[PDB]
Amino acid sequence: AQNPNCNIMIFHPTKEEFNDFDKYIAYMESQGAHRAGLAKIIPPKEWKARETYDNISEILIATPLQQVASGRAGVFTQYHKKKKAMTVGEYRHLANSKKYQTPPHQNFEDLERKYWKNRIYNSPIYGADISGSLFDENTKQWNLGHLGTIQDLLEKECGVVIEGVNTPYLYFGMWKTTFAWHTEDMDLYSINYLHLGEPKTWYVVPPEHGQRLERLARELFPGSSRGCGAFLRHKVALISPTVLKENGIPFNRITQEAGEFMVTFPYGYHAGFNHGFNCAEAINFATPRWIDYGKMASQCSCGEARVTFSMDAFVRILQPERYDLWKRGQD
Numbered sequence: 001a002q003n004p005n006c007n008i009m010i011f012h013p014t015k016e017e018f019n020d021f022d023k024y025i026a027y028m029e030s031q032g033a034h035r036a037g038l039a040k041i042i043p044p045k046e047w048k049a050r051e052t053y054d055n056i057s058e059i060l061i062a063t064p065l066q067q068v069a070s071g072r073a074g075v076f077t078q079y080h081k082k083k084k085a086m087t088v089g090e091y092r093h094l095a096n097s098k099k100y101q102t103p104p105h106q107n108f109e110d111l112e113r114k115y116w117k118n119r120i121y122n123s124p125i126y127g128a129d130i131s132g133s134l135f136d137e138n139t140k141q142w143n144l145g146h147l148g149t150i151q152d153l154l155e156k157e158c159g160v161v162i163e164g165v166n167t168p169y170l171y172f173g174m175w176k177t178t179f180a181w182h183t184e185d186m187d188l189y190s191i192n193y194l195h196l197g198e199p200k201t202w203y204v205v206p207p208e209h210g211q212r213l214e215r216l217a218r219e220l221f222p223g224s225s226r227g228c229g230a231f232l233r234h235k236v237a238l239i240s241p242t243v244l245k246e247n248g249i250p251f252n253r254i255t256q257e258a259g260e261f262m263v264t265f266p267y268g269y270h271a272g273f274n275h276g277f278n279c280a281e282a283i284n285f286a287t288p289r290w291i292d293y294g295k296m297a298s299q300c301s302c303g304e305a306r307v308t309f310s311m312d313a314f315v316r317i318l319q320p321e322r323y324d325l326w327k328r329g330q331d
């Protein structure tokens with residue numbers, strides 16, 4: 001078995017190997033990359049997502065989210081308080097202000113220490129889940145707005161034609177902005193490109209060990225657990241690497257820098273934070289190996305997790321028994 005210790009793998013495709021996205025994902029899995037739950041892909045040096053980022057300031061962040069923490073430094077939840085719209089220019093200025101900017105630090109490790117020590121005492125503002133793309137339409141390779149759709153994958157593998165569309169989302173981050181512990185909707189893959197700015201640190205649990213994370217989470221967030229049998233779908237819970245080590249949960253960590261892709265694999269729980277002002281683009285996708293994970297994915301039916309139009313069809317076709325109760329949650 002390749003990669004038996006489930007380490008995060010880093011790939012350096014050639015321009016030639018960067019032509020066929022599906023085939024490269026399949027290559028990565030042949031080498032065991034999925035075992036980690038997360039891989040890094042460094043694009044060939046000839047590749048570019050677009051010519052420059054000089055003209056992005058007029059993008060609107062219609063609902064910036066202030067991420068308010070509760071709990072203790074290593075075990076907390078966050079809630080998203082909606083703030084007034086601002087442009088990316090305004091947001092960048094805010095991220096760079098004395099109140100919100102990244103503190104002086106030695107290196108990534110020192111900054112990680114500072115994050116876990118101090119995150120709870122601040123409420124950074126995140127521009128998340130903004131429909132859109134920063135890839136130039138002329139970028140032919142690994143353009144997250146030109147991937148094959150999940151609906152087409154399901155049609156190709158299973159023969160059923162369904163409604164729904166699949167488009168990318170932009171994330172504008174600042175110091176301490178945080179993504180809670182989650183897998184993707186319907187345990188899909190995701191791909192994330194860091195277009196610009198400061199890094200993003202990721203933590204990940206191997207898919208084969210995801211249930212160990214869930215068991216810990218139920219112990220650490222006991223009222224949330226009683227409220228919903230899939231409360232990590234709410235995307236609000238954080239657990240530090242110290243806490244995970246104390247409880248024997250297998251995980252890995254890696255820092256993504258501007259110009260790099262990360263791929264999360266089905267049922268790979270991940271969480272992380274941004275180091276300073278940045279912009280990422282991400283999208284879910286499927287492969288044939290995903291199907292069985294989609295069939296088995298947990299669902300939130302308490303009604304908090306409230307998810308896309310397109311997830312309806314996935315649940316309807318892959319989880320017909322759940323369909324009924326899940327849609328009661330969605331309506």
Ligand SMILES: O=C(O)CNC(=O)C(=O)O
Pocket residue numbers: 171178179190191192264270280282283
């Ligand atoms: O970048 C972020 O804030 C969150 N991204 C993801 O969880 C992802 O790409 O799967």
Ligand SMILES: [Mg+2]
Pocket residue numbers: 055056057058059
């Ligand atoms: Mg603009």
Ligand code: NI
Pocket residue numbers: 182183184190264270
């Ligand atoms: Ni994710």
Ligand SMILES: [Zn+2]
Pocket residue numbers: 227228229230231233234300301302303304305
């Ligand atoms: Zn729920």
